[PDB]
């Protein structure tokens, strides 16, 4: 594979907080969006060059946010863009600067930095995580709050929606994971001891964990044994099956490619899934069947990483850091594996 680092400041030399690719993309060109302290959300056009190296093209600027923006999210269909941050306003941008975007609904109800947003599979439900110690469920069509999960006692820096639409996985800064059943609207599980997770000393503002695209397994970063990434299953969420050791700095991000790859084992199904884990200064690339990582890139950013994102086809793996610079990982035709 090849790694290309963006050496031009995307948001005028300010730290980058989030990245997201357009899930609605279905071809070779993918649309990427960025969040920064400049209170602006920049959507870029990312496509491979003739040599295969990543090329970034600026499309639009979204300066409606009054304060800094921490998380930017695309809908699974790619229609609606979710953006919230220091001003704590969740904007549902829609395609109306090369292009233009307009906010559909104002999903207000948060107080300060909103760190993690996860789209439900249907795209009509939102999970919102912010410093305010709460998780709020919203209706996209209604644009109104319908459920509240404020049991968190520290900075809620990570949340993901179950692809099967059964539970809600939340990671807070209190080294405690909280699972919320989607039908009961109450806490399903509580795990804090094998502490298991890293304390406030971990320097990343995010604790973004994500379910496996099928939802069978849950990968949680920022763990302790030493820094590691624990793996949970739907069968038992109160004991991790295994952990991936990451000596050095603590892992902060877990993102899984939405493309199912053929087997060339954490979970036993005829398909394997390649996911990306971002630490403070290193990135380890694993797959479902192989315990050891098949890829590792480091010493490419001068400061702490913030967010990563896979492309729709898996050909792009964007990496964002806090130094104002970003980077991408480019794979050739089906280098990761054979798609299903």
């Amino acid at each position: 594979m090849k790694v290309i680092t963006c050496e031009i400041a995307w948001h005028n030399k300010e730290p980058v907080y989030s990245l997201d690719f357009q899930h609605g993309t279905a071809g070779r060109i993918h649309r990427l969006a960025s969040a920064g302290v400049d209170t602006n959300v920049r959507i870029w056009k990312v496509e491979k060059g003739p040599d295969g190296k990543a090329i970034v093209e600026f499309l639009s600027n979204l300066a409606r946010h009054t304060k800094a923006v921490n998380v930017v999210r695309f809908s699974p269909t790619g229609e609606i863009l979710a953006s919230g941050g220091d001003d704590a306003v969740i904007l549902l941008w829609k395609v109306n600067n090369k292009e233009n975007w307009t906010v559909v609904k104002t999903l207000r109800g948060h107080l300060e930095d909103v760190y993690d947003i996860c789209w439900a599979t249907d795209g009509n439900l939102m999970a919102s995580a912010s410093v305010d110690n709460t998780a709020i469920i919203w209706d996209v069509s209604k644009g109104q709050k319908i459920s509240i999960f404020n049991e968190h006692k520290s900075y809620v820096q990570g949340v993901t929606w179950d692809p099967l639409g059964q539970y809600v996985a939340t990671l807070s800064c209190d080294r405690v994971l909280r699972v919320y059943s989607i039908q009961k609207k109450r806490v399903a599980f509580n795990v804090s001891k094998m502490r298991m997770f890293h304390d406030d000393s971990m320097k990343s503002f995010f604790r973004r964990l994500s379910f496996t695209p099928d939802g069978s397994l849950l990968l949680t970063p920022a763990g302790c044994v030493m820094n590691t990434t624990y793996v949970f299953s739907r069968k038992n969420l109160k004991r991790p099956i295994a952990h991936l050791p990451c000596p050095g700095k603590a892992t902060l991000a877990v993102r899984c490619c939405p493309v199912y790859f053929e087997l060339r084992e954490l979970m036993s199904l005829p398909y394997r899934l390649v996911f990306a884990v971002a630490s403070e200064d290193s990135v380890l690339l694993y797959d479902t069947q192989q315990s050891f990582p098949f890829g590792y890139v480091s010493n490419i950013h001068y400061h702490t990483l913030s967010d990563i994102s896979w492309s729709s086809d898996g050909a792009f793996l964007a990496i964002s850091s806090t130094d104002g610079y970003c980077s991408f990982v480019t794979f050739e035709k089906d280098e990761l594996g054979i798609p299903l």
Partner: peptide
């Protein structure tokens, strides 16, 4: 300045898997 060290596709042993 930084000295980049890049490892290609080898199908690292310092990061070998550890189980429990």
């Amino acid at each position: 300045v930084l000295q980049p060290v890049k490892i290609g596709c080898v199908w690292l042993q310092q990061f070998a898997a550890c189980f429990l």
